[PDB]
Amino acid sequence: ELIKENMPTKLYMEGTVNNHHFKCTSEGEGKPYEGTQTMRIKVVEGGPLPFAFDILATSFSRTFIKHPPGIPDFFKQSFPEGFTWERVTTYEDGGVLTATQDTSLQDGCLIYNVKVRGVNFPSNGPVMQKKTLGWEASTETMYPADGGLEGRCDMALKLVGGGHLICNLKTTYRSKKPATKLKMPGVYYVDHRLERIKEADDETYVEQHEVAVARYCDLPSK
């Protein structure tokens, strides 16, 4: 329909982490019905960053989740109007990262505008010492609430040396489409894997790939 089998993306990000101002742009494409996509990211102001890029990774694309037929796709249904989200990520060592995003569809292209704000990352911790090795796979639970979706998950950042730094994510996804036009899902789950494919020049160029698939819980009941 409006969301084709192949779909290009463009993203504009602006933020500050521990008072460090920066900007990024990216471009990618993916297969929205297959749940895959790639993003090529450039830090265009404030580079090289004094924190691990990993903490921005999830801020760089909900349309590219594979929803099987029994699960109404909130995000795909939101077009042509699009949707927005806002998220708080709380790291167990005190860093907090907040992000808000607008998603819109313009002349065949998904356009993302993202504002990020990070505070209280410990100067001695692995994020500011850039001692991280990317994210483990994780599962996000989606709960319908008041016309929108509440996403919740935990994620863990691999550390150089072994071990993980754990964080908790809370997101609220809201549609710009009128609620009369949206079939809401029930509770469901999204499994994600987000991998870095390439990086250059002290993380001022990064290429990421995500795969994300929605499912219900297949565990037996009574």
Short mmCIF file of C-alpha atoms in Angstrom, two decimals:
data_model
loop_
_atom_site.label_atom_id
_atom_site.label_comp_id
_atom_site.label_asym_id
_atom_site.label_seq_id
_atom_site.Cartn_x
_atom_site.Cartn_y
_atom_site.Cartn_z
CA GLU A 1 0.00 0.00 0.00
CA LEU A 2 1.98 3.06 1.33
CA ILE A 3 4.45 0.79 3.01
CA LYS A 4 6.12 -1.15 0.18
CA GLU A 5 8.15 -4.35 0.31
CA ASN A 6 11.32 -2.27 0.22
CA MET A 7 11.34 1.09 2.02
CA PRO A 8 14.04 3.63 2.32
CA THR A 9 14.75 5.73 5.47
CA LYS A 10 16.38 8.97 6.41
CA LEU A 11 17.04 10.12 10.02
CA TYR A 12 18.01 13.41 11.67
CA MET A 13 19.17 13.34 15.26
CA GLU A 14 20.17 16.09 17.62
CA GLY A 15 21.23 15.73 21.23
CA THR A 16 23.46 16.13 24.26
CA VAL A 17 24.89 13.47 26.51
CA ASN A 18 26.53 14.61 29.78
CA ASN A 19 26.34 18.13 28.32
CA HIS A 20 28.13 17.09 25.07
CA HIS A 21 26.11 18.48 22.11
CA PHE A 22 25.98 16.52 18.86
CA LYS A 23 24.16 15.79 15.62
CA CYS A 24 23.82 12.73 13.44
CA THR A 25 22.20 11.90 10.16
CA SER A 26 21.55 8.51 8.73
CA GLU A 27 20.16 6.65 5.84
CA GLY A 28 19.04 3.11 5.38
CA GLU A 29 16.53 0.81 3.84
CA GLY A 30 14.85 -2.44 4.77
CA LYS A 31 12.08 -4.91 4.26
CA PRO A 32 9.24 -3.92 6.53
CA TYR A 33 7.24 -7.15 6.14
CA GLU A 34 10.30 -9.27 6.74
CA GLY A 35 11.42 -7.30 9.90
CA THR A 36 14.89 -6.32 8.66
CA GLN A 37 16.74 -3.10 7.93
CA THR A 38 20.11 -1.45 7.76
CA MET A 39 21.18 2.11 8.74
CA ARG A 40 24.37 3.95 7.76
CA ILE A 41 25.02 6.64 10.33
CA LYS A 42 27.32 9.65 10.34
CA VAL A 43 28.05 11.91 13.31
CA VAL A 44 28.04 15.32 11.64
CA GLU A 45 28.51 17.69 14.64
CA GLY A 46 30.30 17.07 17.91
CA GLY A 47 32.33 14.12 16.67
CA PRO A 48 34.14 12.15 17.69
CA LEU A 49 31.78 11.46 20.56
CA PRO A 50 33.23 11.19 24.10
CA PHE A 51 30.73 8.39 24.93
CA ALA A 52 30.06 4.98 23.45
CA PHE A 53 27.86 5.23 20.36
CA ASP A 54 26.12 2.11 21.63
CA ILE A 55 23.90 4.25 23.83
CA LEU A 56 22.38 5.90 20.71
CA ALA A 57 21.89 2.64 18.79
CA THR A 58 18.24 2.10 19.70
CA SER A 59 17.41 5.68 18.98
CA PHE A 60 18.16 5.11 15.29
CA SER A 61 12.42 2.27 13.25
CA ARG A 62 9.19 0.45 14.29
CA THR A 63 7.69 0.14 10.81
CA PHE A 64 10.24 -2.63 10.10
CA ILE A 65 8.89 -5.12 12.60
CA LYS A 66 7.50 -8.28 11.12
CA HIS A 67 4.01 -8.75 12.40
CA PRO A 68 2.32 -12.04 11.53
CA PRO A 69 -1.32 -11.80 10.31
CA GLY A 70 -3.01 -12.36 13.72
CA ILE A 71 -1.26 -9.33 15.26
CA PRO A 72 -2.55 -5.94 14.24
CA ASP A 73 0.39 -3.72 13.26
CA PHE A 74 -0.06 -0.37 15.03
CA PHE A 75 2.87 1.19 13.26
CA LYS A 76 2.12 0.10 9.68
CA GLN A 77 -1.54 1.14 10.12
CA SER A 78 -0.50 4.65 11.28
CA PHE A 79 0.43 5.86 7.79
CA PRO A 80 0.12 8.07 5.92
CA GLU A 81 -0.02 10.13 9.16
CA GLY A 82 2.82 8.35 11.01
CA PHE A 83 3.51 8.10 14.72
CA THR A 84 5.79 9.24 17.47
CA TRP A 85 7.45 7.84 20.57
CA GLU A 86 9.20 8.84 23.68
CA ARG A 87 11.48 6.66 25.69
CA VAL A 88 13.46 6.69 28.91
CA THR A 89 16.41 4.37 29.24
CA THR A 90 17.76 3.89 32.78
CA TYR A 91 21.18 2.41 33.19
CA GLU A 92 21.97 0.52 36.38
CA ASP A 93 25.02 2.66 37.02
CA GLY A 94 23.05 5.90 37.03
CA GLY A 95 23.08 7.12 33.35
CA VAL A 96 19.66 8.12 32.11
CA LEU A 97 18.94 8.58 28.35
CA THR A 98 15.69 10.12 27.16
CA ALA A 99 14.65 10.31 23.49
CA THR A 100 11.69 11.50 21.54
CA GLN A 101 11.01 10.76 17.94
CA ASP A 102 8.70 11.80 15.18
CA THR A 103 8.05 9.36 12.31
CA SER A 104 6.47 10.57 9.05
CA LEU A 105 6.16 9.29 5.51
CA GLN A 106 7.19 11.71 2.77
CA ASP A 107 7.34 10.91 -0.96
CA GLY A 108 8.05 7.24 -0.48
CA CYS A 109 10.57 7.68 2.26
CA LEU A 110 10.31 7.17 6.02
CA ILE A 111 11.61 10.31 7.70
CA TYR A 112 12.74 10.26 11.35
CA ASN A 113 13.47 13.33 13.51
CA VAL A 114 14.97 12.42 16.89
CA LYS A 115 15.97 14.45 20.00
CA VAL A 116 18.15 12.81 22.58
CA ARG A 117 19.14 13.85 26.15
CA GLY A 118 21.55 11.82 28.32
CA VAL A 119 22.56 12.68 31.91
CA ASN A 120 24.56 11.32 34.79
CA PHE A 121 26.66 8.82 32.93
CA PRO A 122 29.52 8.13 35.31
CA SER A 123 32.75 9.58 33.95
CA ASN A 124 34.57 6.47 35.10
CA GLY A 125 31.98 3.99 33.69
CA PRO A 126 32.22 2.06 30.42
CA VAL A 127 29.93 4.31 28.41
CA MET A 128 32.14 7.36 28.97
CA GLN A 129 35.31 5.27 28.82
CA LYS A 130 33.98 3.75 25.55
CA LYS A 131 34.51 0.17 26.83
CA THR A 132 31.36 -1.41 25.29
CA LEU A 133 30.83 -4.20 22.65
CA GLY A 134 27.20 -3.80 21.62
CA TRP A 135 23.88 -5.04 22.73
CA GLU A 136 22.51 -8.48 23.52
CA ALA A 137 19.32 -9.57 21.77
CA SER A 138 16.21 -8.69 23.75
CA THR A 139 12.49 -8.92 23.93
CA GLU A 140 10.21 -6.00 24.19
CA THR A 141 6.77 -6.41 25.60
CA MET A 142 4.03 -4.31 24.09
CA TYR A 143 1.00 -3.39 26.18
CA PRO A 144 -1.93 -1.47 24.70
CA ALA A 145 -2.89 1.58 26.79
CA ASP A 146 -5.17 4.57 26.17
CA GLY A 147 -4.96 4.42 22.38
CA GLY A 148 -1.16 3.94 22.25
CA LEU A 149 1.38 1.19 22.95
CA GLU A 150 3.59 0.89 26.03
CA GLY A 151 6.83 -0.91 25.27
CA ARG A 152 8.98 -2.30 28.04
CA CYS A 153 12.25 -4.15 28.01
CA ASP A 154 15.61 -4.68 29.52
CA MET A 155 18.80 -4.50 27.54
CA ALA A 156 22.37 -5.33 28.29
CA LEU A 157 25.45 -3.84 26.94
CA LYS A 158 28.47 -6.14 26.51
CA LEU A 159 31.57 -4.86 28.21
CA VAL A 160 35.19 -5.03 27.20
CA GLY A 161 36.67 -7.47 29.66
CA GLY A 162 33.41 -9.46 29.99
CA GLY A 163 30.21 -8.72 31.89
CA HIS A 164 27.34 -6.42 31.05
CA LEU A 165 25.91 -3.11 31.85
CA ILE A 166 22.16 -3.43 32.23
CA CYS A 167 19.48 -0.91 31.47
CA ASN A 168 15.75 -0.72 31.49
CA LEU A 169 13.70 0.89 28.68
CA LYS A 170 10.17 2.38 28.89
CA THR A 171 8.58 3.70 25.67
CA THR A 172 5.30 5.19 24.82
CA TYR A 173 4.27 4.91 21.13
CA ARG A 174 1.46 7.17 19.96
CA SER A 175 -0.20 7.28 16.52
CA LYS A 176 -0.88 10.54 14.60
CA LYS A 177 -3.75 8.73 12.94
CA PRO A 178 -7.23 9.11 14.43
CA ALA A 179 -8.02 6.26 16.83
CA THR A 180 -11.19 5.39 14.88
CA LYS A 181 -8.93 4.12 12.11
CA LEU A 182 -6.70 1.85 14.12
CA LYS A 183 -7.20 -1.73 15.12
CA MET A 184 -5.40 -2.12 18.46
CA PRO A 185 -3.46 -5.31 19.21
CA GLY A 186 -3.58 -7.11 22.59
CA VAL A 187 -0.40 -7.82 24.53
CA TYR A 188 2.45 -9.07 22.44
CA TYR A 189 6.17 -9.43 22.21
CA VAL A 190 8.90 -8.22 19.86
CA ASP A 191 12.21 -10.02 19.70
CA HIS A 192 15.04 -7.84 18.49
CA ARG A 193 18.62 -8.29 17.44
CA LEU A 194 20.59 -5.13 16.74
CA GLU A 195 24.12 -5.56 15.42
CA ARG A 196 26.87 -3.22 14.41
CA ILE A 197 28.24 -4.21 11.00
CA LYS A 198 30.83 -1.58 10.45
CA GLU A 199 32.41 1.35 12.06
CA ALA A 200 35.10 3.84 11.01
CA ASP A 201 37.00 6.86 12.34
CA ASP A 202 36.39 6.49 16.04
CA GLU A 203 32.71 5.68 15.73
CA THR A 204 31.82 8.73 13.54
CA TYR A 205 30.67 6.32 10.97
CA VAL A 206 28.53 3.33 11.94
CA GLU A 207 26.50 0.77 10.08
CA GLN A 208 23.77 -1.15 11.99
CA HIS A 209 21.46 -3.93 11.18
CA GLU A 210 18.29 -4.88 13.01
CA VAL A 211 15.95 -7.77 12.83
CA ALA A 212 12.67 -7.62 14.75
CA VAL A 213 9.79 -10.07 14.80
CA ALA A 214 6.49 -9.84 16.71
CA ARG A 215 4.83 -12.90 18.28
CA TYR A 216 2.33 -14.00 20.94
CA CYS A 217 3.46 -16.25 23.79
CA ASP A 218 3.32 -19.90 22.55
CA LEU A 219 3.70 -21.30 26.06
CA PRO A 220 0.86 -23.68 27.03
CA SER A 221 -1.92 -22.55 29.43
CA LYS A 222 -5.20 -23.89 30.94
#
